[PDB]
Each structure stands twice: as structure tokens, then as C-alpha cells.
Amino acid sequence: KDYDELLKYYELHETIGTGAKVKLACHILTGEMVAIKIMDKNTLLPRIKTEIEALKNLRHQHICQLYHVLETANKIFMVLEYCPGGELFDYIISQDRLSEEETRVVFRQIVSAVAYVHSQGYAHRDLKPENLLFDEYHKLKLIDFGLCASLAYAAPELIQGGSEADVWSMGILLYVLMCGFLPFDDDNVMALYKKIMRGKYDVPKWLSPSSILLLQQMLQVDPKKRISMKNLLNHPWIMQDYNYPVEWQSKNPFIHLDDDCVTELSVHHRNNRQTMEDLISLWQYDHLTATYLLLLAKKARGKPVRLRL
Ligand SMILES: NCCCNC(=O)c1n[nH]c2c1CCc1n[nH]c(Nc3cccc(F)c3)c1-2
């Protein structure tokens, strides 16, 4: 009976992830695939409120989109953009490591998401390959804003008790993509803590001089000597082969609304377009937010803006 409300809107499928859990599901009104993050309230908690509040406020081409927050006596449900491509983590593992060229393709997407997160006044604080998914177009989507304002990924000053720390974590990520293993690792947490504080890591033979130089700028122990996010957007390495800076500004507006989506919702709601717009622009992350955003996603995927009434 904890699933009663949910089953009004979505048809559930197989659980894909466990231990929060994650279920694949279909949104009935649009027919769009989603992923539903299911969390127990008793067996847990403000970590969830943190995240939900973050995702309500963040909207971006490289952030896994929150469509819908449902809450029951026992459960909390988060209906999220469906990323069939799987984790960045598993993809590195299959390839062993990424080429510099492929690392750059991926890394630009990470910078874009993180630069935007910082622009909105947040720090992610838990950046790692497990927190990055590929959508059906092999585009990166950032997840899990629960620790936002993994020891392997933590900046020295964070460990010692905000946006500088993210730059450091992006550095570790950069290293992992190109190397296939951590720059700092150890069985023992305090030994790891010490390696991180010292800041010395193996520099593998296959890294280009330009890779090594970027790594060295991002992985500065002193946060004040560390490349800033602004300077990362147009770093020589980042610009290689692209010749334009990372486009970090969000498409996916809060203010501009899609006319076709407004129209189809208007006919469902049997109201006029101005009423429908005011209603959408409250962004309450109820079924309306879900349906609007899912109609928009239907449209981007080149499908007709159509509800199933
Ligand atoms: N720090 C640990 C993070 C916990 N993991 C997730 O929340 C999570 N893992 N995987 C997902 C999510 C939420 C959004 C999300 N959308 N699509 C997928 N996963 C997915 C994975 C494989 C096939 C597929 F169709 C979907 C997810």
C-alpha cells in the first residue's frame, strides 16, 4: 500500500539498483521511461531533503533531471531521468581506461555540469564515476546531490574540516578516466588520508604532457594554488580539438516554457494557456511537473507532444 500513489502515475519494472533502491518504470501519461529512486523513512534522512531541494533548484543538460517527488508515511519516491547507458564507473572498467580524446569528450560534460552547479550557489561534494550516468545518446548525467552544500575523491581541505573541493574531485576523476585506477589509494583510511595530504601520485607513461600539466593544476593540495573553475572552462587541454570553451550554461530553462507542451497540457486541463503557464511555473515537482518535463523530453527525442488520456 506504500506503492498505491506511485502506481497511479507509473507502471513499475525491474529494480536495477539496490542498497535507496532504484526501479525502472514507465510514466503512463507520456509513455516515457523513468527511473524511480525509492527510499525508506523509518530505516533512516535530511540527506534526502538536501538532495531533493538541490535538484528542485538545479536544471541542466548534464544533470539527471528530477521529475516528481512523492511521499508516503513510509516511503519517499524520486522520479528521475532515465539513463540507460549505465555508470561512468562500469564503462572505465570495461575499457580499462579512456584515451585522452575520449576522456576529453566526457570530461567537458562533467565540467559543464559542475560549473553550472557552482553558478547556482551549490557544491556537489561527492563527485566520482559512480555519480555519473550515460543517457541513451551517451551523454553524461550527474546524480546524487545528497552530500551537497569517496574518500579517494575528497580534497585535502575537505577532509580536514566548497567549490575548490569539487575541482580537486574532478582532478581525481580526470586521473581515473585516463589511467583506470586512483591516484591515491590504500587499504587503511588514515594511510589514504596521508597520501592525499602529501599529494604525490604515479604519473603513468601513456599520459601526454598536456594531460599531466592539467592534472597537476587540479590536484594542488593547497586550494588557493589550484586552478579555478573559471580557468578550467577554457584550459588549453579542455580546448584541444574543440577550440571553444565548455558551454556550462543551462539549456533546459525554468522561465521559458515550451508552447507545444503548454498547449497539450491546456487541452488536458481544459484551461487557457496563461492559466496553464502559471500552473507549470510553480514547479511543485508533482505529477504536473513530471508530465510537463516528460512531454518536453518526448519532444527532444523527436516524438510527438502527445498525452495518453
Ligand atoms: N552514489 C550512489 C548513487 C545511487 N544511485 C542512483 O541513484 C542511480 N543509479 N542508477 C540510476 C540512479 C538514479 C537516476 C537513474 N536513471 N537511470 C538510472 N540507471 C539505469 C542503469 C541501467 C539501465 C537503465 F535503464 C537505467 C539511474
From Swiss-Prot:
Residue segments, region UBA-like: 257-296
Tissue: Expressed in placenta, kidney, thymus, testis, ovary and intestine.
Catalytic residues (positions): 126
Residues annotated as binding ATP: 16-22, 37
Domain Protein kinase: 10-238
Role: Serine/threonine-protein kinase involved in various processes such as cell cycle regulation, self-renewal of stem cells, apoptosis and splicing regulation. Has a broad substrate specificity; phosphorylates BCL2L14, CDC25B, MAP3K5/ASK1 and ZNF622. Acts as an activator of apoptosis by phosphorylating and activating MAP3K5/ASK1. Acts as a regulator of cell cycle, notably by mediating phosphorylation of CDC25B, promoting localization of CDC25B to the centrosome and the spindle poles during mitosis. Plays a key role in cell proliferation and carcinogenesis.
Pathology linked to this chain's protein: Defects in MELK are associated with some cancers, such as brain or breast cancers. Expression is dramatically increased in aggressive undifferentiated tumors, correlating with poor patient outcome in breast and brain cancers, suggesting a role in tumor-initiating cells and proliferation via its function in cell proliferation regulation.
UniProt name for this protein: Maternal embryonic leucine zipper kinase
Organism: Homo sapiens
Taxon lineage: Eukaryota, Metazoa, Chordata, Craniata, Vertebrata
Gene (UniProt): MELK
